[PDB]
Design a protein around this ligand. Structure first.
Ligand code: NA
Lengths: 221, 225
């Protein structure tokens, strides 16, 4: 699958396109429950349904983690509910460490109402999610972990939008480093080189990537 | 971890006690938001946090599935959101098949509204959950899968209470067979044999397993979970 960051980015973008976890539509943009308009759409949940694909992604996740964080810095892996859970389960297995998962909302009240699994005080926990857009929803999960006694300095996702400043800075501002396999820039570059898409389509995707909030406003949102 | 149903039931029960996924308390029972009162409590979600335990559980799950269902009867494994998901992820991996998961509630429209992942029309799907009490919440998940075009004839859980009279038939009535590693009866058997518990505690657990609603009503609770 590749050891270096660049081959992992490439292979991951190719996979996202190969099984159409990524879709483009310049003519009829994707409209989101939040009222965002976009010519791009990704569903990383799709990836769980392809045995060879998910294996490769999990192999590359473990490589990314051990390369950029280390081999013995993580005592447990916690998945964000829901879409982070399958990936957390596989990464936890590969890393031979305890798994937890973190509920979006507490069940009851207490320093532990969002944590499922056993979490030892002092454990260094890696937060795993499928993707990040602007990382705002990660603050909840990081907080639940820290309140429950965990040390959290890293978050891993498969896919990092990398089009909003916030995706890195919201995490850095609460002392968490972001790690990922690929971004929209990797998808765009592979898509271009492939020859499979119309220039009109990729032109629009690129426009969105450079200024997505403005692009949304000019096409709907 | 063993190949026959008896040794898998004993090993699973021992695991549940070893990491205290199971707890007993007869004098100060567990009181649920329904007001149900029980001297027993189980949290299967704790099992995901023990690397050797979860490996044994998943090996035993794969054995149970291939022994009692077959080797080529399943095209995909779908976990019930949320506690089913980790176990479905590991079982899908072991079986070398696509995974999906099933939402409690549909999101948006279309045949696949209640499914996440990719589900090929015609796929024979195994529903996976951590546990079942009376199996009533399972009907939703089987429906969701059938609506999306799956064939579903089997549901697998780690733990089947086996104290409420419909927990098998409510599924059999909709042409689904329940498969499980262990029950409360297995937990009681191993707990008694271990010598680790007070006699009074196990006597009360036993009374509860035999007549749960009655026990609940006599010890502070309501008549239904
Ligand atoms: Na869906």
């Amino acid at each position: 699958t590749g050891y270096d960051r660049q081959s992992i980015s490439d292979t991951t973008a190719k996979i996202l396109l190969e099984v159409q976890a990524v879709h483009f539509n310049a003519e009829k943009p994707f409209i989101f429950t939040s009222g965002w308009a976009s010519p791009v759409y990704i569903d990383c949940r799709k990836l769980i349904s392809y045995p060879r694909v998910r294996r490769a992604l999990m192999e590359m996740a473990e490589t990314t983690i051990t390369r950029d964080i280390g081999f013995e810095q993580i005592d447990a892996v916690a998945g964000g509910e829901t879409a982070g859970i399958p990936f957390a389960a596989w990464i936890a297995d590969r890393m031979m460490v305890p798994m937890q998962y973190v509920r979006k909302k507490p069940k009851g009240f207490g320093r532990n109402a969002q944590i499922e699994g056993h979490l030892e005080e002092g454990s260094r926990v890696l937060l795993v999610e499928d993707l990040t857009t602007d990382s705002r929803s990660k603050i909840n999960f990081v907080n639940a972990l820290r309140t429950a006694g965990a040390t959290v300095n890293h978050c891993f996702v498969l896919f990092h939008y990398n089009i909003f400043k916030e995706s890195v800075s919201v995490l850095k501002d609460i002392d968490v480093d972001l790690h990922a396999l690929a971004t929209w820039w990797d998808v765009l570059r592979v898509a271009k080189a492939s020859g499979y898409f119309e220039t009109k389509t990729l032109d629009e995707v690129e426009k969105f990537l450079h200024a997505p909030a403005e692009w949304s406003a000019a096409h709907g949102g």
